[PDB]
Design a protein around this ligand. Structure first.
Ligand SMILES: [Mg+2]
Ligand SMILES: [Mg+2]
Ligand SMILES: [Mg+2]
Ligand SMILES: [Mg+2]
Ligand SMILES: [Mg+2]
Ligand SMILES: [Mg+2]
Ligand SMILES: [Mg+2]
Ligand SMILES: [Mg+2]
Ligand SMILES: [Mg+2]
Ligand SMILES: [Mg+2]
Ligand SMILES: [Mg+2]
Ligand SMILES: [Mg+2]
Ligand SMILES: [Mg+2]
Ligand SMILES: [Mg+2]
Ligand SMILES: [Mg+2]
Ligand SMILES: [Mg+2]
Ligand SMILES: [Mg+2]
Ligand SMILES: [Mg+2]
Ligand SMILES: [Mg+2]
Ligand SMILES: [Mg+2]
Ligand SMILES: [Mg+2]
Length: 131
RNA sequence: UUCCCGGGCCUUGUACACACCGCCCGUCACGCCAUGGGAGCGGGCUCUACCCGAAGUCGCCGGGAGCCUACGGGCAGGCG
């Protein structure tokens, strides 16, 4: 018996592979299906990825944004079917895996610490040029 | 003729004038009106210091990087 292998077999039915790769510090726009009454639509949530905790299929990530003066954080299951798509708005360069410190920074101070990551931006540009 | 009462004439003081059975002061009691002080309570204006900070002009960059060119250039964009 390989208990770890049996678990992966169960989850393989629900594993997604159509989402783009990103890192904490990147600016990301998540398009999420919402239910309001008896209707379904798509709501976009755009912000800075501050945390990705990995458990294989059970991976989740957290996105932070300031909306109408109030900070908001949303935690998403990475393989959730409720995610329509994820867009890469901006590539950021961080020096650590968890970015809880930006909760106590102003907008100018956040822009200083999370500067654009040139190397990964060029890789996104080199990709998608295969037209 | 000292004293009690009443009167006469002159003079003197007066805050009295239906005129001393005149006038008049202050506390206290009650009522009305406005007001000072007062643990505090609720507001308005204003000053100083620091924090965040839109638009926009201005200054610097414009690259490890987009667009235009008449390019020792410009626009977008970034920083202050
Ligand atoms: Mg973990
Ligand atoms: Mg990890
Ligand atoms: Mg775990
Ligand atoms: Mg979280
Ligand atoms: Mg979490
Ligand atoms: Mg992380
Ligand atoms: Mg990590
Ligand atoms: Mg960390
Ligand atoms: Mg931290
Ligand atoms: Mg006579
Ligand atoms: Mg006399
Ligand atoms: Mg007289
Ligand atoms: Mg009288
Ligand atoms: Mg009297
Ligand atoms: Mg007295
Ligand atoms: Mg009485
Ligand atoms: Mg009284
Ligand atoms: Mg008073
Ligand atoms: Mg009083
Ligand atoms: Mg300022
Ligand atoms: Mg300032």
């Amino acid at each position: 018996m390989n208990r770890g292998a049996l678990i992966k077999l169960v989850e393989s039915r629900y594993v997604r592979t159509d989402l783009p790769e990103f890192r904490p510090g990147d600016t990301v726009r998540v398009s999420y299906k919402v239910k309001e009454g008896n209707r379904t639509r798509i709501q976009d949530f755009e912000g800075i990825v501050i945390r990705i905790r990995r458990n294989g299929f059970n991976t989740t990530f957290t996105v932070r944004k300031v909306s109408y003066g109030v900070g908001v954080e949303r935690i998403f299951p990475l393989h959730s079917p409720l995610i329509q798509k994820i867009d890469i708005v901006q590539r950021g360069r961080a020096r650590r895996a968890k970015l809880y410190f930006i909760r106590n920074l102003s907008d100018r101070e956040i822009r200083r610490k999370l500067r654009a990551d040139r190397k990964r931006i060029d890789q996104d540009r080199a990709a998608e040029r295969a037209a």
